[model samples]
Target: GNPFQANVEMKTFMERFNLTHHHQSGIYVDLGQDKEVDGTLYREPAGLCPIWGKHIELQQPDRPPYRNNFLEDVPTEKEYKQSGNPLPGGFNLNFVTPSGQRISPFPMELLENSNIKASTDLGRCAEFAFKTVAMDKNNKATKYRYPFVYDSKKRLCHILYVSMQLMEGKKYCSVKGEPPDLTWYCFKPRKSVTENHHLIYGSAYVGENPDAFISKCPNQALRGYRFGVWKKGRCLDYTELTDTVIERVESKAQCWVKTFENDGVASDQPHTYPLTSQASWNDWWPLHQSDQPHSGGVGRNYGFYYVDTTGEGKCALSDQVPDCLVSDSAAVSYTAAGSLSEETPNFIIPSNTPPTPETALQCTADKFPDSFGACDVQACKRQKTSCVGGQIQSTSVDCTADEQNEC
Candidate 1:
């Protein structure tokens, strides 16, 4: 029996497409070949499936959004121009070529700085969109053109994984249900390891699930999602997903978290989070069994790389963050207790011990000045302080800055 509904109303809905059976050849007597009379088929009001394939496994992520926002009412070209904002912060006009390669050219400040003033673009007329309007105002139509001001910059944009790390202080999420997703931060790859190939976040929308395709008889085992470039609520190429697009989306999320969290200190300590080869990154998958591991059992073989790459690392729970965003990075300078103040709650990570042996190596990998070189090459006193156990357990590298150009 087909696994769909057989109601007359449903049948009428499916029939809107003028579809009869699988093939036009009437000689074929396979009842299951065409639309089933007894069982139901998942036809659309549009009479077609919108997603790209039956199953897909995204390797990297869509590039961070050149432009991002969601809402029915938006700004007009005239108003956007008058606002004096050069370009909308969320809009991703361009991205790093290869996935997980470099930081967005738009400037990390624009992505993260919510308090930032607006700029104008003579080429693209600007518009304004507002999230909320008070009743006291008389003009129902907001005078401004671009009306929408997004709440979470991350929500308005997308970010994917290039280099990955885990922390308890803040969590990175993906709409696809994964944890510790990518962000816009730059990372330095560790050459010390034997395995090659930096982990660039890809999108499932690009390709179908490898497992389902490999199976001889396909069943409900596949878990594929939709793919396409979104332009003003419309899909560009409904099927093919690109690595650049995924990375762009991932960058948006990362930009917001980093910028907002570390605003004033950016210029003073630029190139935060010195991710060197010998450093370590936290792993939060152990918090839950089915968190971010592959589908295969713990022996190290995931059942299927396509759908179950993150058996324990899945981060698919509703409580799990839906969008992946990078929160913070390490400062180029050493932590001197009162060096960097935290306006928010335990946001910035504090180093109790002088620093790790790899700390100096990280400086070199990140291309610091000769005088600035110091990982474990300590020159200051140390003291013990309380560290939130899960917050910043290991060192997470963000090699995307150098790699962004490749994307």
Candidate 2:
């Protein structure tokens, strides 16, 4: 008759959600409410429940995690005070505004090329605090700053989501894990398609998972994982489930400009921040002002959105290579392939058929011309030779360069 433990009806209700009561901290009570232990009251079971999570059929995810008759039983402020305050600042999953819009628990990285470096700002819970050495090698008191329970809910939330994604990749994990889950990357939206937003890549610690929260949660989820900013704003605010899109190791790709067309515009591409139509951005959210002074403001923008790529057109796992970081993206270009001699230069020529490599192709060097000519616009030849794929696919572009610089 323990309230915390799942009862027979609670067990049956857990089955409704296909949840195993033993594995999930989610519990049940009379009508999912904590009641006084009155020996005079007879207990009866109704159904299974999720103490917290998005409602299965609710249109607004911004609502509270629990559905009707269910309640999240995270430790309350009094509970913490009684337990020597092990969990600080209190906790819950719902942080929504009155109008039903929820604020992101993690920081938004919609700015172009935004790369977040790790610091003590994103800290951990106290479960593993004693493992850290607060002194120097010489036994001197040192400034050991990280691994503390962070007060900033956004930063702490980022830690939790990153941990959740790590467990997802490696078959789900817990809170007592490590920092720096993985260096990663990569969104879309909606009916009739808000297929309207462009995807921007940046590096930040924003992240998701269920076991990542609640009083019984882990404090070790504060590792900084730099992944892409795919979705931001009202309709879609989502994240990647894995950390290995690019990883913290190679985020330089996310830092600098990679597009050939935008070559001289910026040293690092300016991230397309929340292109807001509604004035919903936080004070820290950057505005896009194109030098029109005070009059300039957000225009008609469908903006950045996130779509699940599991089975969608052109974004399927089969077309996963339709994506590549261009390990050989390090190539140098020339006006013509002959610009470099055989002694120092090798080139890939374009033609109706696949052109042969001038000498030997270096995996890292794939030169491109500033302007397209006969070989490219003849509607001449079209192809891509990605380094990882180890081969190039060809197409006849079929056209010539025009005086108007048209190809």
Candidate 3:
């Protein structure tokens, strides 16, 4: 029985809420605790799990004999570690929707654009270490980072929900012998609702049957999946399952339900350092202000904010200042109207005293026709020295004027 058809109650729920097939606003998680074999326990998926999209083979694969030629080399963990650069793989997947439309991983680009780039790798490393350590205890690692598309128009979100179970001594898998099963979940707002929270409605399973659909879940009782709207703060603090429900169906082949009994204790563990709200998240997190001597001042602000400086918005007085750098000796006086004057009060000197080279040059340049040459040469010499200091090759032509007015 197809869930969408067999489950009339859930279908109405989806249509009533205007839950379109795309758009996801947020990701919710329930970081429940699981016990360890040592009698101790920790939050399941103790470290954050990162969601990744699949990679695309840009070029067609070569035939069996020439396969190694075109294929890119994938480095081993040991090789990557030895190289000292551990930035995880780049974004290479052409993530597409069920309808075959390409899309970016929602909120992932948002998080990556923030200043959290440095910490994502460390968080990813934590996940890897946790996975390796937990594999020995048959802990059933439930922590997952699932990427989804957030639809702008519907304010809805879609993601793939996959589950796997061990079958007797053999590893659990779908009929195709894939270890895990996949399902699609769509989250949307309640009918006419406008809030941060959303309701969940999705399929029991969306893939085809590996074994014949005629025979499936033979020994086990089939059940449909449903979710309930969790109260505002219930997701943060509630310990027990609150709004998720399971409905037994004659044929669980494809069944759905609408219950408010999903897992509680939702925790959105970000792959990077938590946001400003989680400022107190960690003490020894990498790249803290203390790591470098020239990092900044002693206070917590750490130079991110300045009490008095030429800030960008209100400080755009570009016209007020001239591009030329005036020596400290220049006497500048503004008119009553706050307008700048071309001539300085100290430009005139007594007739008997001959002007020094500096004064003569300044006044001569101010009054004479080719006076600009002296000033231009001074500016160009300064530029030339700066270029040398910067290790750039600078030539005299940069400051030189045409044949008559050599700078």
lDDT of 1 at 58: 23
Q: Give lDDT for model 3.
A: 0.20
List, residue by residue over 325-383, the lDDT tens digit for candidate 2: 11112221110000111121111111112422222212322442222223333223322
Q: Give me candidate 1's TM-score against the actual structure.
A: 0.13
Candidate 1: residue 406 Cα off by (Å): 49
* Cα TM-score per model: 0.13, 0.18, 0.17
**What ranking emerges by TM-score with the best candidate at the front?**
2, 3, 1
Residue range 1-407, candidate 3, lDDT tens digits? 21222335423322221111111111122122233333433222111111111111111112221122101222334643543322112111234557986332223233323333223321212212232222223544433322222222243233321111011111211222222221111111111112211222111111111111111111111111111122211111111123212223232111111111112111222233323343132111111121112101011100000111332211001111111111111112110011011221121121123422221112222232221121233223211211122221111224344422543
* Comparing 2 and 3 on lDDT, the stronger one: 3
Name the regions of candidate 3 deviating beyond 4 angstroms. Answer: 1-12, 15-77, 87-134, 137-267, 270-407
* Candidate with maximal lDDT: 3
